[PDB]
Design a protein around this ligand. Structure first.
Ligand SMILES: O=C(O)CCCC[C@@H]1SC[C@@H]2NC(=O)N[C@@H]21
Ligand SMILES: O=C(O)CCCC[C@@H]1SC[C@@H]2NC(=O)N[C@@H]21
Lengths: 235, 235
C-alpha cells in the first residue's frame, strides 16, 4: 500500500506495533538487503556506548539491513549516511539539524536523533532513532517541540527513506562523497571534550578523509579521533 | 510508524514493492498470527478457481495469517470474514458492494474484489485482492472508477485492517455471527447456474449453517453447493 519508489532501501518494510529493538531484530533475522524494520515503540531500545534509548510512541524507530561490503577502509562511514539522511529530512521540514560527531543530530544543541550502526561480517544494520511527536528526556528535543506542532510520522518516514536510498546508492559508487556532506552539516569550530581512555579538550576542526574527528589541543597538538568507544562533550 | 491500533490483525505488517504472491509468501514463511503481507504489485497473483489474478500497481493486494482453530468447520466462514470486511470498507467510502457466493464482491454486478483462503499447514492464510486505483479487466470495476477519483490506498488499508480485526475477534467468540452478516450482504433470490460436471440451474435462495449455497431447481429439488472448486454464473 506504501508505493515506495526507492531502489534498495525500502524494497521491503517490516512494521511492528511493538518490538524489543529494531536493531536486534535486524541483526538476528534472515533479511534481504534494503529491508527496513520499523516499530511504533521499542521496549528495549539501544543506544551507543551501551546506553538505553527511550522509544515511546510518536517517534521514528527503524533499522535498515545493508550489505555494502566496499573496501574495508571506507565502511565506517555508514553512520554518516544515517546522520546526513536525518539532517536532510529535518531541513525538508525546516528544522536546523546539525551533526554532533560521530552519530548524533542536534537542534540548538539538543539531541533530536541518534544513529547506531552494528555490523557482523557482510551484514550491516543501520539503526536510526528520531524524536518526532513523542515526549523526550532532558537533554533532548523533537520535531514537534521545534515546530510547535505535530508532524505526520509517515511523511517523515517517506522523506527519510527516500533520502537514505539516494545517499546509499551514491555511497556504493563514490564512498567519499558522504564526507563532504557531513562536513557541511557538522558542528565544528567549537571547543569539545573527548571522553575515552582518559580525556582531552580542544577545538573540533573538521573530519578527515577517513571520517576521523580532528582536534587541535591548546598546545597545538593535533589528535585524530577514531569512531569507537569514545564520546564527545560540548563545553 | 503506521500506528495501527488493532488487537491481532496488523500487529505486524510486511510490505513489498513487488512480490510473486502474498498468499504464497504467507504460506511458506513462519509468521505470527495477525501478520499482514501486502505488496504494491504481484507478478504471480492467483485466484480461487486456480486462475491468475491481475495485480497491477494501484490495487490493494494482501494476505493475513490466522490460526483461529475453532471447532474445525467454521472454515468457509473465514472467506466470509474477508468478503464482509471488504463490503464494510467499501461502505465507508460510499460504495455499495454485494457478495457473490462464495468469495467475490461486486458493485452493480461488476467485480471489485476477490477473496482466496488457503489453510495449508495449520495456519490459515486469508488473501484479499481489491481494485482501488489500478486498471481493471473488462467487466470489472474499481473504487476509483466507482467514485470517479483516486482513493488514498493507505486509507483503504487502514479501514480494511480495522474491520477485519473486529470481525475476526468476534468470530473467535461467536463464530455463527458472520453467517447472518453474509446473508444480509449477499446476492440472493436470483437465478444461477452451477458449471461443471452435473451442471444445473436454479434460484440461489440462501446459505446454510455450513456456508453452503442453497439452490432451488425448477423441479423443486433443493441442492446444497459446497464451497471449493465451484463456479457460479448469474442468469
Ligand atoms: O544516539 C545513539 O546512541 C544511537 C541511538 C539509536 C536508536 C535507534 S532506534 C532504532 C534502532 N533500534 C535500537 O534499539 N536502537 C536504534
Ligand atoms: O477472486 C478470486 O478468485 C480470489 C482472488 C484473490 C486475490 C488476492 S491478491 C492478495 C492474495 N495474493 C494472491 O496471490 N491472491 C490473493
Amino acid at each position: 500500500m506504501l508505493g515506495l519508489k526507492t531502489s534498495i532501501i525500502g524494497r521491503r518494510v517490516i512494521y511492528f506495533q511493538e518490538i524489543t529493538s529494531t536493531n536486534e531484530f535486524a541483526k538476528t533475522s534472515y533479511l534481504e538487503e534494503g529491508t527496513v524494520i520499523v516499530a511504533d515503540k521499542q521496549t528495549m531500545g539501544h543506544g551507543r556506548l551501551n546506553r538505553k534509548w527511550e522509544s515511546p510512541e510518536g517517534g521514528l524507530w527503524l533499522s535498515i539491513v545493508l550489505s555494502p561490503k566496499v573496501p574495508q577502509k571506507d565502511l565506517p562511514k555508514i553512520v554518516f549516511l544515517g546522520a546526513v539522511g536525518v539532517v536532510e529530512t529535518l531541513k525538508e521540514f525546516s528544522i536546523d539539524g546539525r551533526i554532533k560527531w560521530p552519530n548524533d543530530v542536534l537542534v540548538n544543541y539538543k539531541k533530536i536523533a541518534g544513529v547506531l550502526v552494528e555490523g557482523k561480517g557482510d551484514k550491516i544494520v543501520l539503526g536510526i532513532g528520531l524524536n518526532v511527536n513523542n515526549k523526550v528526556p532532558n537533554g533532548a528535543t523533537s520535531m514537534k517541540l521545534e515546530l510547535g506542532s505535530e508532524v505526520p510520522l509517515l511523511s517523515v518516514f517517506r522523506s527519510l527513506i527516500t533520502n537514505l536510498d539516494r545517499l546509499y546508492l551514491n555511497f556504493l559508487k563514490n564512498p567519499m562523497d558522504i564526507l563532504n556532506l557531513v562536513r557541511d552539516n557538522m558542528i565544528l569550530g567549537v571547543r569539545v571534550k573527548i571522553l575515552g581512555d582518559g580525556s582531552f579538550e580542544g577545538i573540533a576542526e573538521d573530519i578527515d578523509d577517513f571520517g576521523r574527528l580532528i582536534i587541535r589541543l591548546d598546545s597545538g597538538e593535533v589528535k585524530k579521533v577514531i569512531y569507537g568507544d569514545v564520546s564527545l562533550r560540548f563545553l
